[PDB]
Amino acid sequence: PEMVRGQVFDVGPRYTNLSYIGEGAYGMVCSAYDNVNKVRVAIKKISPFEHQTYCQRTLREIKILLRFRHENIIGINDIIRAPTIEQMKDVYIVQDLMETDLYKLLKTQHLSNDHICYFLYQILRGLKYIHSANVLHRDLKPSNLLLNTTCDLKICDFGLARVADPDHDHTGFLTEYVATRWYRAPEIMLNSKGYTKSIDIWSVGCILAEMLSNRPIFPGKHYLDQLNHILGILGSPSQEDLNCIINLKARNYLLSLPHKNKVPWNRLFPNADSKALDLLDKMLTFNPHKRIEVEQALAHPYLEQYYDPSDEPIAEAPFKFDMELDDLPKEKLKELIFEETARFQPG
Ligand SMILES: COc1cc(F)cc([C@@H](CO)NC(=O)[C@@H](C)N2Cc3ccc(-c4nc(NC5CCOCC5)ncc4Cl)cc3C2=O)c1
Q1: Atom in ligand 1 nearest the alpha carbon of residue 159
Q2: Which residues carry this modification: Phosphothreonine?
Q3: Three-state DSSP class for 163?
């Protein structure tokens, strides 16, 4: 078998001529030549089976991505693994190969207002589909936005996704949370489990702000610093918004802070299109109940050159997990991953 930077990559005979792309906690990613479709593809080698959290992420992504079909959402083309549960130590996920991601692009390139517009449109168009399936992505950030050489955009990494559950969103103050800090809505630190669609709108808001300046808008250095940064720009929440926070720890924390005025978007973003800043304000609303929804955001003046609801498709039906996954041992989750990848086996 081919080796890449001291790792077996058992993807043959279909996939050859591998090149390293990258690596992270998830595993390792290569490009490979696909000898059936005669195209280079992305292959990621995941080795999740010793970690319940890794098995959860692998299973959620696979189930979601094999169900969903949308231009602004990465597909799974193929999955390679051993013929038996006993012999299966790795899962290789084959996906369309993209040139870059928005994280890398923002560190190296100024985006024209027209690029910002088009990128935001594609993000919201993909998100409309995801929300229409009653799914929350829950980890939207530049590195989860893949781009090709013509700036077509695809959302990736559905391993933190969940079905929306607005009736069970309430929790206590500073309750611990997994998703990426600079893109976390204020309510996560105050009273929310991140089980409503407004969590994703907040993250998109953060992405938009970052496209305008090439710098994250709320770069908290650590957990409660994240809310400091948010309140530093939004200012003190209104009495009405504060009254929506019924938990006393969270309420009284907010009341203890000195009055801060709103920093106006046109001072933070002096070169930005005014319509972009109006949409930005609506996405970065403190109160998640008042926060714009994905379909309204698509209908916003800033996106008028692109808006076409007949060309912004929705999912055929809501997505459901057959069983609750968070209370399943890694051994059961491995069984479910085996089952879920069975359709790619010869036979
Ligand atoms: C601890 O964490 C874990 C544990 C797990 F058990 C499973 C996961 C899974 C599910 O949650 N998560 C991921 O796999 C995330 C983290 N990533 C990594 C990754 C690398 C490359 C590409 C990619 N990249 C390209 N092209 C690149 C772009 C940049 O520039 C260079 C070319 N094209 C096509 C593709 Cl799918 C996509 C992804 C992706 O989804 C995570």
Answers
A1: 11
A2: 175, 180
A3: strand
